[PDB]
Write a protein that binds this ligand. Structure first.
Ligand code: NA
Ligand code: NA
Ligand code: NA
Lengths: 31, 31, 31, 31, 31, 30
């Protein structure tokens, strides 16, 4: 799954492996 | 999954969620 | 001390060395 | 530019390269 | 523009914003 | 002290709070 470090993002490729960019503008797991 | 950031460790609890302290003294995925 | 990177957690072992999982679900110093 | 990881700071040197300490005590891009 | 945190990768999307996955299997700045 | 995340550095200001740029070229505890 996605690391739980808070990282702001605008798109999914901004995030670490396993993550997508959530509607809150942070990297998160895609569940 | 363990995050793939390189983190030096002594013991498993030094590591982020999903990780253990591997043979080579870095955090990594179990086995 | 606990590094001042914001990381969400469920239990203490989710956090980096020096940190515990606070009642707000973020890593921090046991102080 | 400053990495978009949430990191608390009291002064710019607390942050990663490219970053300054913003008005709310987190690391961010200058200006 | 790539943060200088050492992160191992298999593909560019594994890396933070501004980074690509070098032939070295680490996140780094592109050309 | 300093987090044990590997961060490459040229100077101390490249590092997180409590850290300096050590002779190994990485941020560490002073
Ligand atoms: Na831990
Ligand atoms: Na710094
Ligand atoms: Na990415």
């Amino acid at each position: 799954g996605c690391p739980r470090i808070l990282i702001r993002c605008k798109q999914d490729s901004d995030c670490l492996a396993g993550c997508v960019c959530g509607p809150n503008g942070f990297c998160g797991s895609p569940a």
